[model samples]
Target: MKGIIFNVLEDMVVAQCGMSVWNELLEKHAPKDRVYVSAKSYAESELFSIVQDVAQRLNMPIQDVVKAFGQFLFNGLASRHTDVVDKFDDFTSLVMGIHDVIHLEVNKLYHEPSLPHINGQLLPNNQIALRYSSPRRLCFCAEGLLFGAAQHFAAAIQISHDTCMHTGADHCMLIIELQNDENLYFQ
Candidate 1:
């Protein structure tokens, strides 16, 4: 986990609740310093602890909280690395290139990013099958990132999971169907 992730999570918390709540979360779970540098890697447990507290305070499912964080994280990451995002012309192209383009960049930037492996396969009728495997097993967050990318491209998409780690599958298989609707906002 990179410190930029913690910074983004902190920003999300501040935007959703307030700075006071973020301070409270840090006071309870984190060290005295509230600032996190972008290039530093913190303990993974720190993030999990904060997320657990956030879920309890927000009265939302843990999956939902992480999924929403995935969405917010996309915007944060894309804004930070517009050069990487500008290489793709559409959402599908971006999704298909995650391993080669996105993770490759992450690898170059960091010595050990520990990113999830995502393999994208094009299916019939503008659908895609994404096979995701990670020790973290945060498939909902991955799915939410797909939603965020679709929103960024202003494309409509529907997602369903055929297999999930949560359901005892070794990997998560997500089926994403591209729709013709122009609306980017998804329910």
Candidate 2:
């Protein structure tokens, strides 16, 4: 994965667990016993190991920790990619725009580990559909993005993980819609 991902995981770890735990985890999982940089790409196994180690040390479920990280990631992304984020009016717009715009920029910025393939469609019923495919199977992180995006937009949304790769599927389908139709969309 991109080195920024590792940096975010490091952010999440130190914020929730503390710097001491982060240093300890780094010593255990980091190949060089150090955190990665934003301009580099590290092995997928190393990132997964750090996350699994963080979840274990925190006494939280792996999925939960991943989701939390995803949520945390969204905030960081807004700051890190403001040029891209500023184009979207709200959360769903941002989510739907991922495949069309965000990934294009991400690929341009980081060439090493590729971004996950997200096939996004806007349904006629107004729900957003996202087909997420990645070898790492970090859909729960996507789930956290849903949470984080809603919070960032100050909007309420109904998110459904109708299909999950973790549940023996080839890809995960994430559906997101406004909680209610009351002119509560992008503002």
Candidate 3:
């Protein structure tokens, strides 16, 4: 069985956060080892801040979020040894529901921008920045949730390439699925 879930975020903003927060998260959750990956121009510290904010809003500890995310990863595993299709479906359903809830909450606080011109039209960076600010919060919150889910579901799944891109757009996605031999992993 296959399923797709989408989240349309609003007024997403991207900014830098201090290294202290990053260290804190790492120290708290990934103490023994760190996962090294390619760095993008977007701010990693800011993303941590977003996660913290969402965790606070949910009235849950950040570790709980991380544990839940790891669960998402585990859920993606299709055991060749057992009849686990139902478990996979349940995990996907929970992810989809969480995505919808976050998206709706974000939409209430942000406005969508008009499409930008692409023919070498130089729009002021600040203008683009202002328009996409609120949505960034939404994206951060959604991503934090997804990250938590990913930590839970690690080895048996892969995320979509589009979901991995950080374009600073108001809306972003996290496409999670059972691992396939033919698909390339993006992280």
Candidate 4:
């Protein structure tokens, strides 16, 4: 909810599209066969220590954030018996809740950057990327957070498994790709 979303090329946030558009883009622009090693490796890197510095400034335990996020991702709000409609609503609510927490905490430590607007702007400071990903790698809590977040939003969202060199975060980058094609919707 707090990170930047990317398109197939991991550049801009392609808008007014959907899953089908992503598929086509992947097939044409970044076919699996054509995929190559990312210029930089994200695993086991210290590219994002600034996040820890910020965390220290915030006086909040980064581990807690990771755990909360992970738990939500791995184990959703309800069990399988839960109604699908209810589950969807719950998922949206849960994510929105997390969004609120992030906003509150981030605002406390630093004034929101103007050039790279935080809300829905295509490219926010890479600092965000580092903040999210650092805790994710150092703490198992992060893995769970990502898994749960992805699971909950699976229906309407596409998690990009593409490999790339990201400058913002020191470690791996998981691209949250949103579908943005208008033609698919018969409006």
Candidate 5:
């Protein structure tokens, strides 16, 4: 995994919870350099451990922990790549470009080899179908990005999973439905 993600996850914990909460987490889970460089790579296990620890400490489900981090991570990514994410006019368009435009740009900058593969299909009924492939099975994290994009574009969305790799499927499929004139905030 890329260290930037760990960096962002750490930032999310502090920003959402507090510095003390993050320090407490590090004391229990990480307790090392206390920072991750964006360009560096680390063990995937390191990232997984932090996510699991955050869930455990917060008394939340793993899905909820990562999903919240995903939403929070969106702000950092969007702010960092406004020129890219801002190219789309609506949430559906932005969602479709996650792989082609957004992740493409992400690779150009971060240049990591293990980034997950994300593809999208335009479904009927104002929906977007996302296919997620990665051994990490961090589908919930990506799902959070879907919700984050909806929030970023001020679009109301409902998400349903058709299949999941976390449960032994080959990959994960997510359907994001854009509700007309609807906007929601996930905190």
Candidate 6:
């Protein structure tokens, strides 16, 4: 996992709980004087251990915790890369362009970022199909990130995930549809 992910997770914990909570979490889950540099990478288990501890502390399902982190991570990432986000006018295009736009930039900046493969296709009735495949299998996190993107654009959306790697599918298939016209419209 990228060290940026750890930094963002810490920010999420502090923003929602308190600085003390994050300190305590770090004391419990991480090595002494551990500092995460955004451009570097760390052991995946190191991050997962902290997440497991957080799930225990919050008494929530691990999936829910990871999903929430994913949502928060999207905002954190967007703020850091405003120039990339500025190119898109709305939610759908931003998401569909992630591979060629966002992750491509990440790949250029980082060594082996290992981003998931997302194949996007436009569907009828203001919908899109995103097929996600990765060894990490963080589909719920991806779902949360999509929701966060919708929230960022003030777009109401409904996502149906019928095929998932967890349920033995080869890849996760997310069908996302626009749900309202109050704040966002399909382009």
Best candidate (score: lDDT)? 1
State every prediction's TM-score relative to the real structure.
0.93, 0.90, 0.28, 0.26, 0.88, 0.92
Highest TM-score among the candidates is held by which one?
1
Which runs in model 1 stand beyond 4 Å of their true positions?
Answer: 181-187
Model 6 per-residue lDDT at 109:
79
Model 1, position 45: C-alpha lDDT score: 83
Q: In model 2, which range of ten residues has the least summed lDDT?
A: 178-187
* lDDT computed for candidate 2: 0.81
Pairs in clash, predicted candidate 2: none
Backbone Cα, N, C clashes tallied per candidate = 0, 0, 19, 14, 0, 0
Summarize candidate 5's per-residue lDDT along 99-182 as a digit string, tens digits: 888888877887664778889999877778899998878798887887888788777788888799977898999988778534
Say which prediction, candidate 5 or candidate 6, comes out ahead on TM-score: 6
Q: What tens-digit string does per-residue lDDT give for candidate 2 at 1-187?
A: 7788888877887787799988888888775656577878778888889888877877989999889889999988888888988888877678888877888888777775567789878876668888999877889998898788778878677778978888989999988776643355553
RMSD of each: 3.0, 2.4, 16.9, 18.5, 3.8, 2.0
lDDT of each: 0.88, 0.81, 0.35, 0.35, 0.80, 0.86
Instruction: Return the lDDT, model 3, position 51.
Output: 55
Tens digits of lDDT, candidate 6, 1-187: 8888888999998888889988888887778988888889888788888888889888999989988988898899889878888888888898899888988999987888868999889988889999999988999889889888888888888889999999998899999997863444555
Q: Which regions in candidate 5 have their CA more than 4 angstroms from the true location?
A: 181-187
Instruction: Give the distance in Å from residue 78's predicted Cα in candidate 4 to where it truly belongs.
Output: 6.9
The lDDT of model 5 is 0.80
Error of 1 at 1 (Å): 0.3
Candidate 5 least-lDDT 10 residues: 178-187
